[PDB]
Every structure is written in structure tokens, then in C-alpha cells.
Design a protein around this ligand. Structure first.
Ligand code: HEM
Ligand code: HEM
Ligand SMILES: Cc1cc(N)nc(-c2cc(CNCCF)cc(F)c2F)c1
Ligand SMILES: Cc1cc(N)nc(-c2cc(CNCCF)cc(F)c2F)c1
Ligand SMILES: C[C@H](O)[C@H](O)[C@H]1CNc2nc(N)[nH]c(=O)c2N1
Ligand SMILES: C[C@H](O)[C@H](O)[C@H]1CNc2nc(N)[nH]c(=O)c2N1
Ligand SMILES: [Zn+2]
Lengths: 419, 414
């Protein structure tokens, strides 16, 4: 029917009708809820490989219909012609091609439909760089460097996506093998320990195994591993002058800078799949700006990551003998005060979790008021520290899957046949 | 057929077969998820034909648990229940069934992070109770036993099940020990703002309030659908802990204390299709419940502003993370204060680790363990506790604990 959500701190109730326009399964049933499973569903809007006409066209009619509906047509001559244009195109090339307006609309709406993104208040202020003309790893690197440079903007970041040619037969995929454009390398020491970023040890080895000359430090910016039209990937080194970086100091603890830490300024996700009207853009790196907790809670403090808590705690003179002292908790706060203070002192865009969550509530308000709802994933919106003292903690959320969408996809090296 | 949950911190993977044995809604549909919705009639008491299959599932479940499935005593107990539902239109749990029932409802409570202790529960059969006075007595002996001079024990007291929905036993208090809250004319709120509507009801039923900040509320007890009655838990039975800080001399001057015994009394215990509308249960506190939620939620005691000030924090801009900083020190103070007075408590780190250990064991020997990530994860410092990175399948087994509407919304006054 129609579903209400309530904020247990304000008693505000919103009514959700947008969920009726949902098409794919979430993973849940009346009997089992999977809202904490990382990839609960494998429901996909098309089959495995190059789809028949009866597969691809209905998806495409839905998106075109949606887009022409967005702009107060539907039934217009332009819309009817467009249906016939896509129809004949699928007939003759087994696919179709997005108008530039179409592609910008879908890119913004995949962001706007991203149930896990706390940052969607900005969704319509996105910069799309069409790169469907691209043919080589080298051209990919030139498109990515311009993305980085525009997005970074001397520290005053801007949102942007760069969209490479869509998928055709699955053996000509365009892939950024990096999970993010800019990440640090992780090295597997001889004594079993791990220097760098432990998450990337497998990628940092494929790079090495591909010819990369590792400087073997802590903050080694990984190369790019770019794959074009199915071919073997190709290492590229982003010019350092394009990788903005913030050294972490603390506004009271002078001993903090001596910890020797820095992070990069540009979060740029590049392993995900953009899906629009049944077309699959397997390479679509997008970028915005960091919520401090992403660096200071997850990046520095997760166990299988930088794990600096003991060392920051020890420098703080903390009772690390039992958990009850909350020594982990205290260091965690100071680290995030340091991350925020460093990005702001270097006028690099960053948002804290209080103002980020606060804004997402305001976004939710807007979306319900004019769109009839807003898909939100409570498990992922709620920041990983101080949850209950942020507004989203006390806000009920409905989760459902709208298209266009961002999607996970397999890591390419599980799939790619070399040559 | 099977389902896998993965721990994204340790790569450990567990195989949930137990979810096949659930038959109650979660609220989620195949195309929409409601995992963050908090809650997705009295004539709605079960009919005879409604009750037969539920009883059969529970009795089978019980005889299975104890290695007696299909046995002579199983088959006779089965027909013995049918005779009762046929004649009396209900039935009566044996004492052993009731203990197994109450222990499994805890075991099956997917939102409770404390279930590793589930099978050491102390069940007090109060089904022979007929009056409010009898309830107050049973409840005092519960409090006294559970508190055990600071070394808390978990315990449940079960009052007579429902009958026709017209003679419910109800503990009107949401918890047995809670502080009062009085709205001032000027808009401000004294005491605990959660309990302000219940404080009004109490006063209207006669309670003479101290009008202080930490008045323990009177019990408001209802038996056999009669009007509820007031009782004062004898102060010598309410253990309390004054909250001081191990580093901040000034902290004790905040004037704060908390009660020592969390005891929830407003939920409904459901075993074999029977509904025990009054079933108070108790364990011990995890620190964050007092430190993060009770003291710091804006709708609760809301002392972050007061603490940060004495801490000299820059409270002009949120990015200073004063809130975050002041919140930790309070939770340090809560944990130090309880431990000093040798009153049981568990911090969110030990608690969550126990639950991961309990979860794996429950997959080992039971085939699963329903959990609610939205509730298991502590309300502060989430991702540094190990349950954050633990995938969790959520489903409703019975016996279960259930919410029920507030008594003053549905009760018709004598
Ligand atoms: C502009 C400021 C932005 C902020 C503050 C922000 C914030 C966040 C955060 C904190 C997460 C959680 C991810 C994690 O903790 O691993 C997330 C997820 C996500 N964001 Fe946003 N984001 C922003 C911009 C964007 C843009 C421009 C896009 C797409 C064009 C986007 C799409 C997504 C998607 C698809 C996810 C899901 C990630 C996944 O499932 O792995 N975000 N965002
Ligand atoms: C023994 C130590 C225990 C600990 C450390 C513990 C901890 C917790 C915590 C922190 C919550 C979250 C409550 C909230 O934030 O509102 C919770 C929920 C819950 N606990 Fe436990 N608990 C314990 C014992 C028990 C016992 C003895 C029972 C029943 C016999 C029980 C049944 C429940 C239920 C049903 C919930 C769900 C609350 C709801 O659905 O609203 N717990 N527990
Ligand atoms: C556009 C954007 C803005 C922002 N503030 N963060 C991210 C962001 C997203 C992810 C994806 N989450 C699962 C991958 F493992 C990982 C990160 F490390 C991020 F930094 C992305
Ligand atoms: C047996 C037990 C142990 C423990 N540690 N906490 C609770 C506990 C449970 C609730 C229920 N939550 C829904 C109402 F909001 C509220 C509290 F205030 C509690 F303290 C109960
Ligand atoms: C709306 C949201 O589900 C709600 O605020 C929940 C989140 N998780 C919770 N978890 C616990 N333990 N207690 C709570 O009250 C809540 N509240
Ligand atoms: C099991 C669980 O889904 C997993 O740990 C999630 C929890 N919530 C998260 N939320 C965000 N924003 N980012 C994450 O990586 C995760 N991890
Ligand atoms: Zn769900």
C-alpha cells in the first residue's frame, strides 16, 4: 500500500509512495530481512551476456519513458521518435546509444537513487564528463587525469563522473581495476606484518606483478590499472601534482604531526557499474568529498586497515589494559578532530558527520515532499562513530531499489583472460 | 535451502539453516526493506482452531529439545493440550515448558546483544497471582533477587497469561525502576523527559511526587483487567550508583546517578500461542544505554551541553567534535562508577565481542541466530566494535518477546 516513516526525535512522519516504482528485489522476504548483508540480491535487470531484443528493449522503453516524463513530455513527437530510434538501433546493433541529455539525467539519478549515500543533497549538482569516444588505456588515463584535476579544483572539490563506453558483448569491457582512483599501496612484510593499506595488498601485488616499481612506503599512491575494450590492463602513474594530500596534525596535540600520517583529498569510486535503461557502463569513476569519519574512523581505525588506535592511545597515555577505560573510544575522537582540522586548515573540502547527517535529513524532507519518497539504507547512512547523537540514528528509513542505479560488479581479475 | 553471512573483518562465514523454521513476518517485503522501522486489538485473542497448531509446534519443539520427540510422554502431552483447548478454549503450560519458553524467547530476541547469558535465566512462576497486591509482592522479590547486592542476576517473573483480553495483567511501568519527569510551566523539564506522561498518570492516580530530578517512580500494577494500583518499591530495594569520573574532580558535582537494574516490564511474552501480557525481565546494563542514550539523547537527560562546558570545549562549531568528546568521558564515568561500587555492568566492547562469540556458537549447534544489526551495534563508536562488520540475518522465531500497546490507550476504567 503506502508506507510511513517516523523520526523518533521529532515525531515527524513522512509518507512514502515512491517505493511503488521499485523494480528489483532487495533480498528480503516477509520472513527474513537482509538489510545488513553487503550484497543481498543478485537480481539483475538483464541476462548474462548480449541480450535479445525482447530482453533489452523493455528496459530501454522504461528509461526513455521516465526521462521524457521527467521533462513534461511523454507522448511528444520527440519521445515517440526516440522509441522508434532505439527500437531500430537494437534491431541492427543489438544495443542503443544515449543522447547526451539522457546520459546526464541517468547519471544524476543513479546518484539520487543511491540508498547508501549520505551526500545526496547535492545530487543534481553533478558534472558528467562523456567519454564514450574512448578507445585505449592511454585515452582512459587522459580522461581520468582531467577528472581528477577538475574535481580537485585546488582543494575546493566538485562532484564529477566520467563515463566510458558501455558494455557490448562482455569481452570488450572497459574497467578501472583500481577500486578508487587514488589509494595507498599495502605491502606484505617478511615478518607476516603489513605496511601501508592492508585492504590493497592484493591490488598492490597485481600492480607489482604487472611491472610496478614499488617505493615500499606507507603512503605510496598506487598506479592506475586501466583496461579498454577487453584488452590487457596497463599501468599508469598519476602525476603527483594532480593528487592533493592533507598532512594530519592536531589542534592541541603537537605530538600528533610526528605520527607521520597524511590522507588524500579526493574520494573517487571506480569499481562500480552504472546502469541506465539496460545499458551497462562498467567504467564510471565518480567523486565528491569526504565525510571525515571515512578517513578517521574507517580508514585509520578499522582493524584490517591502518589500525593506528593503540599507537595514538599510547601517545595519549591511556589505560589500555582493559576495554572499560574506553581508550579506543577516546583516541578515535581525537583522530577525527585531527582529520577535520587538517582538511579545514588546508582549505580542502570536507564535511563532518554532524552536518552531513543533518543535511541528509533535510534532503529526505525535500524528496518526500516533491518526489513521494527517498530510498535510504539505515545501516550505511548512520556514521560509524557517535551514531545516536546524530539525527539519522533516530530516523526510520525505507530501502528499495530504483533505476538508474550504481551496482557492484566482480573484481575484473577474477574474470579477465590474459594474452 | 541455506544462507551465508560473512564477517567482513575476519572473512569468517556462517551457514544459517535455522531461518527455515520461522513463520512470522519481519515487515520487509520482497521489494522493500523495513529493517530500521521500529514497529513494522484485545479481542484479537486466539480462537480454538487458531490455538491448536501453535501449541503443537511448541510442544514438538520442546520435546525435540529434550531428546523425547515422538516419545510416549510427548504424544500424551500433545493430546492433553488438545483436550484443554477443546474444552477450556486455552491450556496451561507445565512448569518445565514455561522455563524453556521464557529462556527461548530471550534466545530468540534478535535485538538483544546480551544473549550469550540466555540459558542462565531465573524464571519466577507468578501464574497463581490474582491481585495488584500480589503482583507488587512478586515484583519486590524479583527486584531483590536480581539486584543481589550489586552482583546482578538475570530473572523474569511471569504473571497469568491472557484469557479473553478483558482480564489482562499489566505492569503499566515500561521498566520497573525508572525516574520521573515533570514538565515545568516555563517549558523546561525536570527529571527524565521520557517518563513525563507516565509521571502525569501516576500523580493523577494519587502519587505525591517529590518533584526532584531522580525520583524513583511508583509501580502501577493491574491484575485481572482491574484498574491499576500504586505501590512504592521500598527504597532499600532500589540499588543506585552515583556517577563520578576518575579524572575530573568536577564530575560528581553534576549530581547524576542511575539505577542499577534494567528491568523491562511493558512487553508481551508469547509461548505456544499463549500471551503473557505481564512478564517483567531484567539483566544488567551495558554502559552505553545510560551513557549515550539516557544522558545524551536530546529527548532524554541531554547533558552534553552541560558536560562540554565544564570540559571547556569549543561549542561554537560542530566540527570541533565537542559532542563526540564529551560523550566519551560520560561513558567512562558511567563505567567507572558502577565498577567502583561493585555493581555489574558491561562496556560496549566486551558486550559486542561476547555476542560475536555467542553468534558463532549458535550457528555451530543451532543452525543460526537471528540478529538485528540496527540494534546490536552500540550507539557510539560503532565500527570499532566487532559486530559492525558482522553480517546478520534477521527473522522472528517463537517463543518471542513482543511489543504491546500502552495500557492507558486501551484500558477501560472500572
Ligand atoms: C559530494 C559529497 C558526497 C558525500 C559526503 C558522500 C558520502 C558517502 C558515504 C560516507 C558513503 C559510505 C561509503 C563507505 O563508508 O564506504 C557513500 C556511499 C556511496 N556514495 Fe556518496 N558521497 C558523496 C558523493 C557521491 C557522488 C557524487 C556519487 C555518485 C555520482 C556518490 C555515490 C555513492 C554510492 C553509489 C555509494 C554506495 C557505495 C557502495 O555501495 O559501495 N556519492 N557516500
Ligand atoms: C544479561 C545481560 C543483558 C544485556 C547486557 C542486555 C543488553 C541489551 C541492550 C543494550 C539492548 C538494547 C535496548 C535498547 O537500546 O533499547 C537489549 C535489548 C533487548 N533485550 Fe537484552 N540485555 C540483557 C538481558 C536480557 C534478558 C534477561 C532478557 C529477557 C529475559 C532480554 C531481552 C531483551 C529484548 C527482548 C530486547 C529487545 C528490546 C526491544 O525489542 O525493544 N535481555 N538488550
Ligand atoms: C563519491 C564518494 C564520496 C565519499 N565521500 N566517499 C566515497 C567512498 C565510497 C566507497 C564505496 N564503499 C564501498 C567500497 F569499498 C568507498 C570509499 F572509500 C569512499 F571514500 C565516495
Ligand atoms: C533486560 C535488559 C537488559 C538491558 N541491558 N537493557 C534493557 C533495556 C531494554 C529496553 C527495551 N528497548 C525498547 C524500549 F525503548 C529499554 C531499556 F531502557 C533497557 F534498559 C533490558
Ligand atoms: C529509527 C531507528 O530504527 C531507531 O532510532 C533505532 C535504531 N537502533 C536502536 N538500537 C537500540 N539499541 N535502541 C534504539 O532505540 C534504537 N533505535
Ligand atoms: C555487515 C555490514 O553491512 C558492513 O560491516 C557495513 C555496515 N555498514 C557500513 N556503512 C558504511 N557507510 N560503510 C561500510 O563499509 C559499512 N559496512
Ligand atoms: Zn529488510
Amino acid at each position: 500500500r503506502f508506507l510511513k516513516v517516523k523520526n523518533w526525535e521529532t515525531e515527524v512522519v513522512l509518507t512514502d509512495t515512491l517505493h511503488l516504482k521499485s523494480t528489483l528485489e532487495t533480498g528480503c522476504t516477509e520472513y527474513i530481512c537482509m538489510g545488513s548483508i553487503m550484497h543481498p540480491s543478485q537480481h539483475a535487470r538483464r541476462p548474462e551476456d548480449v541480450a535479445t531484443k525482447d530482453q533489452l528493449f523493455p528496459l530501454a522503453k522504461e528509461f526513455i519513458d521516465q526521462y521524457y516524463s521527467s521533462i513534461k513530455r511523454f507522448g511528444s513527437k520527440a519521445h515517440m521518435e526516440r522509441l522508434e530510434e532505439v527500437n531500430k538501433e537494437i534491431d541492427t546493433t543489438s544495443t542503443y546509444q544515449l543522447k547526451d541529455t539522457e546520459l546526464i539525467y541517468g547519471a544524476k539519478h543513479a546518484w539520487r537513487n543511491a540508498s547508501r549515500c549520505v551526500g545526496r543533497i547535492q545530487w543534481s549538482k553533478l558534472q558528467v564528463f562523456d567519454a564514450r569516444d574512448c578507445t585505449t588505456a592511454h585515452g582512459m588515463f587522459n580522461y581520468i587525469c582531467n577528472h581528477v584535476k577538475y574535481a580537485t579544483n585546488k582543494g575546493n572539490l566538485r562532484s564529477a563522473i566520467t563515463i566510458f563506453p558501455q558494455r557490448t558483448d562482455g569481452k570488450h569491457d572497459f574497467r578501472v581495476w583500481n577500486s578508487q582512483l587514488i589509494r595507498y599501496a599495502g605491502y606484505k612484510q617478511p615478518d607476516g606484518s603489513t605496511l601501508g593499506d592492508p585492504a590493497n595488498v592484493q591490488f598492490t601485488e597485481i600492480c607489482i606483478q604487472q611491472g610496478w616499481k614499488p617505493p615500499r612506503g606507507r603512503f605510496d599512491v598506487l598506479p592506475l590499472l586501466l583496461q579498454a575494450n577487453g584488452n590487457d590492463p596497463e599501468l599508469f602513474q598519476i602525476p603527483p601534482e594532480l593528487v592533493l594530500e592533507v598532512p594530519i596534525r592536531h589542534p592541541k596535540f603537537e605530538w600528533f604531526k610526528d605520527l607521520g600520517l597524511k590522507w588524500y583529498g579526493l574520494p573517487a569510486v571506480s569499481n562500480m557499474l552504472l546502469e541506465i535503461g539496460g545499458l551497462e557502463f562498467s567504467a564510471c569513476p565518480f567523486s565528491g568529498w569526504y565525510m571525515g569519519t571515512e578517513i578517521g574512523v574507517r580508514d585509520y581505525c578499522d582493524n584490517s586497515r591502518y589500525n593506528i588506535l593503540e599507537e595514538v592511545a599510547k601517545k595519549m597515555n591511556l589505560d589500555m589494559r582493559k576495554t572499560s577505560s574506553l581508550w579506543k573510544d577516546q583516541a578515535l575522537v581525537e583522530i577525527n578532530i585531527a582529520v577535520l582540522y587538517s582538511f579545514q586548515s588546508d582549505k580542502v573540502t570536507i564535511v563532518d558527520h554532524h552536518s552531513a547527517t543533518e543535511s541528509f535529513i533535510k534532503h529526505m524532507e525535500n524528496e518526500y515532499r516533491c518526489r513521494g519518497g527517498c530510498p535510504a539504507d539505515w545501516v550505511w547512512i548512520v556514521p560509524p562513530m557517535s551514531g545516536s547523537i546524530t539525527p539519522v540514528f533516530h530516523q526510520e528509513m525505507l530501502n528499495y531499489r530504483l533505476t538508474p542505479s550504481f551496482e557492484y560488479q566482480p573484481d575484473p581479475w577474477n574474470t579477465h583472460v590474459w594474452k
